[PDB]
Design a protein around this ligand. Structure first.
Ligand SMILES: [Mg+2]
Ligand SMILES: [Mg+2]
Ligand SMILES: [Mg+2]
Ligand SMILES: [Mg+2]
Ligand SMILES: [Mg+2]
Ligand SMILES: [Mg+2]
Ligand SMILES: [Mg+2]
Ligand SMILES: [Mg+2]
Ligand SMILES: [Mg+2]
Ligand SMILES: [Mg+2]
Ligand SMILES: [Mg+2]
Lengths: 67, 70, 88, 104, 271, 129
RNA sequence: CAAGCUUGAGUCUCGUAGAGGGGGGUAGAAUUCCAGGUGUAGCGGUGAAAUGCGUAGAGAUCUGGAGGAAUACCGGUGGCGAAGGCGGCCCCCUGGACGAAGACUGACGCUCAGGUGCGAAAGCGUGGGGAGCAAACAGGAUUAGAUACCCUGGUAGUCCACGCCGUAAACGAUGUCGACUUGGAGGUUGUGCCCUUGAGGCGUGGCUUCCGGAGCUAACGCGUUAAGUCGACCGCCUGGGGA
């Protein structure tokens, strides 16, 4: 597709956003690869960091099952 | 993945949905590579061998459009 | 990596017009300041060899600049030596 | 000096001392000469995965322009505190005062 | 730091001397010093209860505080001194009121530091407050067995105890031997490890360095006589019996623990 | 590090002839202009010109005869590190008179044949055939 | 030898990307153990079985706790680094690299025997730790024989700190630096301009990937990052064994 971050001019990605960030994680808690998302390599490396921050702060689960 | 089946849903379609979810998650396909230890040397060799074929296919796709009508 | 204020102070102190910013006196002064700052850093992290190559390069560049200044006109070489406490 | 984006999740039961601890942290920052930026409380959001056998904590976020000494002071206070569950501290390129996506 | 010397003589060839430039190069504190009389392994009946003890060098005793009952009053540390009655060093501590005491020196301590004790002390190496207030996972030293008794656990040169649980009124600890034990929560402990962590690196070099410490040479039962030791006897280097003590008790393997009063505190035997 | 400007000039002109270029612009020099004068006099090149006030640039025009380049082989002789000095008797002859063996001496840098005619030796600069 | 210049080299100013290096913390999956609750005759493994684990409760599940390693997806002929090599996240110090527009010293530049430093893994010494894997070793299996490939255990070691060696197919089998030489299709990173209504359009630097012209080569093949033509320097080669 196209990089929506560049389309909307989103300079930085913050982990605090969840409603517009859940679209980049699969139902199993795995990150949607770039070949499927249609995202540039500049923003994929920032999306991964934001998702990791959210996982650390219990904003996005690592996987569907935890306990 | 949670595949809790609701009412008025056949077991056949429920099991097919569960199988499709497992396939898209790729959990079954990960054991065939996590069942043994791959050396970093072997992993890098496999990665380049897969990368070489992956654009060789596209190179041939873009090169076969010049001749060989059928 | 000296701070902007630290670099500006060295430029003002050593450059004649306060705008030279790159002669064989101000450059050597900045190199000496960086080496002295990194002395304690390496004395703490004695096993930072990757960051040590930059310090070695700075030492080599400073040695080349000092040799060039001595070959060109050795009065500012001597003045810079005692100003910076250069061993040689 | 440097800008940080501290956030922490505290226990849900003893969540009445959150204003007191926030006031104490702000007083410490001001005594350490730190220009406190935005400070928000997200309430008690249910945790995605439970931490220490509890499924919901209380989120507190604050951007602070304070020296690294008092930042380490705050980190140690978070580590030694018993009510707080987790604490995230990260450096920021520049001072940010815009509202968080949670409060929209 | 460990310093090895040149082989100028047999005895200096194989000796290293662990030194410390921060130790007080002078005299100890007289008001806190007492008399230490050596027994040489003799008891009130005159018999030799413990062998390989005698001689050595004259030593004094320094009153080291282990209870740490000064609550609410901070104190500073003046200097470190070598204690011949133990393997670690002793820190001289001066309180706000004017008291002077000897404390076990933590690893992270130096002249000019400040420490306190009580239920409101900060968590830094050198302080002392109850294990109930001490957070779980802490590595402490000079741990008590009973509330207010003093201190008996992890008082050597390089020993430390690790807290792992706070179940109710009791807490669980791993000692240096690898043993889990339960202690009262109201007991006190000093944060951090001990100062002289490299005491074991020393080597004596000669029998003279051991005679200086005062341990007599050990004679071998196989070299003794049958009457003197069970292993003695024979027309040469011979042995036809299991290794046993001079009193018949088996040495290698046979456990000799019979205390059943404190079996409720031993979470797991050392291994 | 550019340690030989004459070799750079020879390489540039040889590559231009191979690639069938029209003009080869380069940073010029006094010796470069002196060599270009000899090339124009001998007809191996078509034209040379120095255009520049602060940084003079020589823009030589390549000469082609029926497709084949006029210059067959350009070779540096007295490269920096191996200097060649031959007297009048032992002055070189390139391609039995069909090529030039340019010689630099006291009376400027005219050519090998002119050096022999004047009776003075010198140092060999370039073999052009 | 002297007096000048910036085009070589270097500095400052604003920005950018990165698993670059060192030190300390924290989250999670999973494996292995410890104890308890359900739980009954099998479990594990292989081409086939067996050594091995089980009614002394094995395998399965749940609960609570202990310990070590690295961080599933991201993840790519993606990125960095002189080379070796680096991958959760955060904090502190710091090296290196690239870009618009500038200002500045003025050949201060390249190579370099002898020397210095770094340098995969394996190995050695001391002090720790050790979950999993796994030389040596034991047992089982195959084979005429198997001191091995198949299996169950299993120590050193692989994990940490401080020390020693400078060994690899340490490879791009292609030494370091400067200039020139048709083109096409990309990846990554920055900047300039035009109406940016959509990664619309035209340019412009650094790194990197695949074809491919001249040319070169014994040929495979290199081919603007050349193995095309030259310049400066170092190291190495002179039949195969012996070695
Ligand atoms: Mg003995
Ligand atoms: Mg007897
Ligand atoms: Mg005999
Ligand atoms: Mg005898
Ligand atoms: Mg016998
Ligand atoms: Mg190793
Ligand atoms: Mg095996
Ligand atoms: Mg066998
Ligand atoms: Mg080689
Ligand atoms: Mg070099
Ligand atoms: Mg090609």
């Amino acid at each position: 597709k196209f990089c929506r971050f560049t389309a909307e001019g989103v300079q930085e990605i913050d982990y605090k956003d969840i409603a517009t960030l859940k679209n980049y994680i699969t139902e199993s808690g795995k990150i949607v690869p770039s070949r499927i998302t249609g995202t540039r390599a500049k923003y994929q490396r920032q999306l991964a960091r934001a998702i990791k921050r959210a996982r650390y702060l219990s904003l996005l689960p690592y996987t569907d099952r935890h306990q | 993945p949670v595949i809790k089946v609701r009412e008025n849903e056949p077991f056949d379609v429920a099991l097919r949905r569960f199988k499709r979810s497992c396939e898209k998650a790729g959990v079954l396909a990960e054991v065939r590579r996590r069942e043994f230890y791959e050396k970093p040397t072997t992993e890098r060799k496999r990665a380049k061998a897969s990368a070489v074929k992956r654009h060789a296919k596209k190179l041939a796709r873009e090169n076969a459009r010049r001749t060989r009508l059928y | 990596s000296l701070s902007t204020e630290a670099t500006a102070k060295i430029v003002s102190e050593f450059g004649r017009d306060a705008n030279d910013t790159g002669s064989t006196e101000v450059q050597v002064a900045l190199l000496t300041a960086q080496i002295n700052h990194l002395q304690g850093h390496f004395a703490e992290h004695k096993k930072d060899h990757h960051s040590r190559r930059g310090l070695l390069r700075m030492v080599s560049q400073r040695r080349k600049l000092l040799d060039y200044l001595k070959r060109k006109d050795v009065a500012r070489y001597t003045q810079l030596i005692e100003r910076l406490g250069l061993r040689r | 000096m440097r800008h940080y984006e501290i956030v922490f999740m505290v226990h849900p039961d003893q969540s009445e001392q959150v204003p007191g601890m926030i006031e104490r942290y702000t007083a410490a920052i001001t005594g350490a000469e730190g220009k406190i930026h935005r400070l928000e409380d997200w309430g008690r959001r249910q945790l995605a995965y439970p931490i220490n056998k509890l499924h919901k904590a209380h989120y507190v976020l604050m951007n602070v322009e304070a020296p690294q000494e008092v930042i380490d002071e705050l980190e140690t206070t978070f580590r030694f505190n018993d009510a707080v569950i987790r604490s995230m501290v990260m450096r920021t390129k520049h001072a940010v005062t815009e509202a968080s996506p949670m409060v929209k | 730091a460990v310093v090895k010397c040149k082989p100028t003589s047999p005895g200096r060839r194989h000796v290293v001397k662990v030194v410390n430039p921060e130790l007080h190069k002078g005299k100890p504190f007289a008001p806190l010093l007492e008399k230490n009389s050596k027994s040489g392994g003799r008891n009130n009946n005159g018999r030799i209860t413990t062998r390989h003890i005698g001689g050595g060098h004259k030593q004094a005793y320094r009153i080291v505080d282990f209870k740490r009952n000064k609550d609410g009053i901070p104190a500073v540390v003046e200097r470190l001194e070598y204690d011949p009655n133990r393997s670690a060093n002793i820190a001289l501590v001066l309180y706000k009121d004017g008291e002077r005491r000897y404390i076990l020196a933590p690893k992270g301590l130096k002249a000019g530091d400040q420490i306190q004790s009580g239920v409101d002390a900060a968590i830094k190496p050198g302080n002392t407050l109850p294990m109930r207030n001490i957070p779980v996972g802490s590595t402490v030293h000079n741990v008590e067995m009973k509330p207010g008794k003093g201190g008996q656990l992890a008082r050597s040169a390089g020993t430390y105890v690790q807290i792992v649980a706070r179940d109710g009124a009791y807490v669980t600890l791993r000692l240096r031997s690898g043993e889990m034990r339960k202690v009262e929560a109201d007991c006190r402990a000093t944060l951090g490890e001990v100062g002289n962590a490299e005491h074991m690196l020393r080597v004596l070099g000669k029998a003279g360095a051991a005679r200086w410490r005062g341990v007599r040479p050990t004679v071998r039962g196989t070299a003794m006589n049958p009457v003197d030791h069970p292993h003695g006897g024979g027309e040469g280097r011979n042995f036809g019996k299991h290794p046993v003590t001079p009193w018949g008790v088996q040495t290698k393997g046979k456990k000799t623990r019979s205390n059943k009063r404190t079996d409720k505190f031993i979470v797991r035997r050392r291994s | 590090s550019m340690q030989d400007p004459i070799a750079d000039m020879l390489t540039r002109i040889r590559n231009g002839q191979a690639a069938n270029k029209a003009a080869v612009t380069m940073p010029s020099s006094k010796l470069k202009v002196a060599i270009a004068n000899v090339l124009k006099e001998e007809g191996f090149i078509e034209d040379f010109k120095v255009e520049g006030d602060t940084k003079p640039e020589l823009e030589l025009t390549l000469k082609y005869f029926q497709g084949k380049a006029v210059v067959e082989s350009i070779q540096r002789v007295s490269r920096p590190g191996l200097r060649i000095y031959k007297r009048k008797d032992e002055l070189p002859k390139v391609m039995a008179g069909l090529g030039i063996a340019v010689v630099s001496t006291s009376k400027g840098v005219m050519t090998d044949r002119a050096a022999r005619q004047a009776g003075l030796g010198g140092e060999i600069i370039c073999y052009v055939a």
